Amino acid sequence: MANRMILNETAWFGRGAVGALTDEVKRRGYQKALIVTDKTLVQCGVVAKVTDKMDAAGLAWAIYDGVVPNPTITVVKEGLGVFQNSGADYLIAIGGGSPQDTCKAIGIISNNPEFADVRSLEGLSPTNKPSVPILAIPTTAGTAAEVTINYVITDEEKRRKFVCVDPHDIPQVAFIDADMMDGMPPALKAATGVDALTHAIEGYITRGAWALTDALHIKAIEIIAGALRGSVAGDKDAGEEMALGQYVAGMGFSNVGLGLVHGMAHPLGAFYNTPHGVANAILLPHVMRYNADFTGEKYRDIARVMGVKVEGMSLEEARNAAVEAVFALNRDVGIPPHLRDVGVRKEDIPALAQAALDDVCTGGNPREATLEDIVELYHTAWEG
Amino acid sequence: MANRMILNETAWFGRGAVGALTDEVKRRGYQKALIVTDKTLVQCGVVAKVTDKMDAAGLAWAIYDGVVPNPTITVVKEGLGVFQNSGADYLIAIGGGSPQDTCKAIGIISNNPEFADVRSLEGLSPTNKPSVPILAIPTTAGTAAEVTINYVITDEEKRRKFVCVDPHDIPQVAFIDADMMDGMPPALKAATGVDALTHAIEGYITRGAWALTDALHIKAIEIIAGALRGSVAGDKDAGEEMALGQYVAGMGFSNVGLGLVHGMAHPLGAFYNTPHGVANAILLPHVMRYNADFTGEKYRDIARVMGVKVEGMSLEEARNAAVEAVFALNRDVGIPPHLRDVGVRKEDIPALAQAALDDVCTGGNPREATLEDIVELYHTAWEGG
């Protein structure tokens, strides 16, 4: 009956937050870090923002930049080998959800060698030891991987993304610095931003929701809905707001769950390598309409913080307004509205739906989804 | 510029939350606990609620119940000795702020022996190693000692309570279980509940306040103001609400600070052993009035979440409403309104004011307080002013 909360024991927030990293490392006595990131972040100079500071403080580090969007089992094994050989005693994840999840997988397996095949970590990972210490530095404003206890890896052999949930993978310190995120192309800010909004909305209405997560989630929705357009536009302060909002969303959903949006988005990532946030964005409003009757007064709350004047509006009208506010936001930030626009094939829907039905996140959906329900949702999101 | 947040990596909430303790211990591989608590909690059977579960799970434990309200350096040293002689490898704090703070001191000194004098830990403790692992189980709905990075010890020799701030003392796991709090006498629920409200209000307007702590604090105020009366009355759900509210308050103030209410309350605890919550309760409304002009629109938010329909009043009226709401709550839960009622002496005011001026928490007050200002505030709280 009791509710558990897993959070970062230490976290730094604000532009310039990464400047606290060298002092945190020194106070922990670590000797060498393995930075887990990708080639784009190295090319854009984002990784240098961190290594330059580390060099100035005389802190040793090595880099693994083989991470690819929607990280695969192959990437995890490659990164793991690099880490084991490096002799590093801690990990620094620099990037969005892909590098951060890869980093979590590496840290967990390094101290829990029984899960060497990686795929065995799906669900509530029965690990016995904490991951190698992880210092997380997000570069996107959407996944909250720095504070959640989950990470998703793509099993290419079985063509499916599997979510791993494990308190042992929580980063020891997170640095939420908007300076690390400004380089995101506007389209990326939009996709990861709606991914964050999806986290907050699904988390707010998830089956396991309770007082504390509801408070975190509704604040996150308000912050995100109020700052996303401005951030996509390039506004500096909105970018900092988004950095906080996406993190606050994570403080909640990591501890209670999500729903059918993520359950349906994962198979798309596995089948087409579709960007996670774009998949969530397209599916979100449709899944919300589907869940409407099972959400109490919560859609009135969502609509209210998304700019809609809900006073004197019926619950039915408020629910329609919440869904429309999301459709509107997606249009405003430029995300394609139909699944056909992003490479999905109708012939694959039966398999995608079954995959969605079996996805870890689907169980938290307020409405118990059937196979045909999911098939219908994919077809509805196909072209409107 | 950047803001730091220290929180419990793991925490369990709700009635029955202590039931998660044995599993958490096993998952961490600890071999023997030293339970830090007091004689009342042992007598009332509260400690047994935990040890019975531990016995059934086959987990070893030893107990130190010598903690006294407003824990002293002597109690810390005695408890440290018991810990060292027990063979325990972790600590379980069962109780209110006194046992929890004593436990933090013990856990820190054990891994940082150069601070054996205890008093040298005041302020931002320059400790190099994390405290011995602490699993915290609060029994009062007010201090949030289970999630904050502070602890206050009484220096009997120098007659003063000193606050210690250190990320190294954060408990590894917190179990917030109202079943552990139901035994609180109504007056204790009242006092500890206003202590929690003070935490939320001071934290909401403190100098270092920012977006995240403001969100936590205003939510804590709403929760506490809405449930305290019912909890004092004995309502079970209200007690569960208070358990959450007092904790949420801590998630915030531990990371930004408090103010003059706590700065003035501490010297009273050192001078008269006045219960912390009672001191804060009497001082709170007066200090709020003092800080009014340096809190922006925040008193409007406080008044609103405390049941006041601020719908059409001005900022000046909203600010008065917030203060009155606190005066009303204190009356409703039966806390004395005047410092004279609880054993304070006017002759001690100059000394109390100086102590308050030097208290760690005072620096966070939104209004720079002078010695003269503090003297005036004590006199005002004396008999209403």
Ligand SMILES: Nc1ncnc2c1ncn2[C@@H]1O[C@H](COP(=O)(O)OP(=O)(O)OC[C@H]2O[C@@H](O)[C@H](O)[C@@H]2O)[C@@H](O)[C@H]1O
């Ligand atoms: N600040 C940045 N500036 C420029 N490019 C960036 C930045 N941050 C990330 N990128 C680039 O954006 C692309 C996508 O990065 P991801 O990490 O894959 O995206 P994100 O949304 O953060 O995470 C997605 C992943 O997290 C999981 O929850 C989800 O299932 C998916 O696997 C990559 O090419 C990456 O280099």
Ligand SMILES: Nc1ncnc2c1ncn2[C@@H]1O[C@H](COP(=O)(O)OP(=O)(O)OC[C@H]2O[C@@H](O)[C@H](O)[C@@H]2O)[C@@H](O)[C@H]1O
């Ligand atoms: N559930 C309970 N049932 C009955 N009595 C209880 C309970 N919990 C605590 N008590 C009793 O209440 C008295 C006060 O307990 P404290 O721990 O001293 O009170 P609390 O308000 O929780 O903490 C105060 C301490 O914290 C610091 O922030 C403050 O400076 C002070 O030293 C003691 O006699 C204690 O045994």
Ligand SMILES: [Fe+2]
């Ligand atoms: Fe999930």
Ligand SMILES: [Fe+2]
């Ligand atoms: Fe303080």
Ligand SMILES: [Zn+2]
């Ligand atoms: Zn997501």
Ligand SMILES: [Zn+2]
């Ligand atoms: Zn207090």
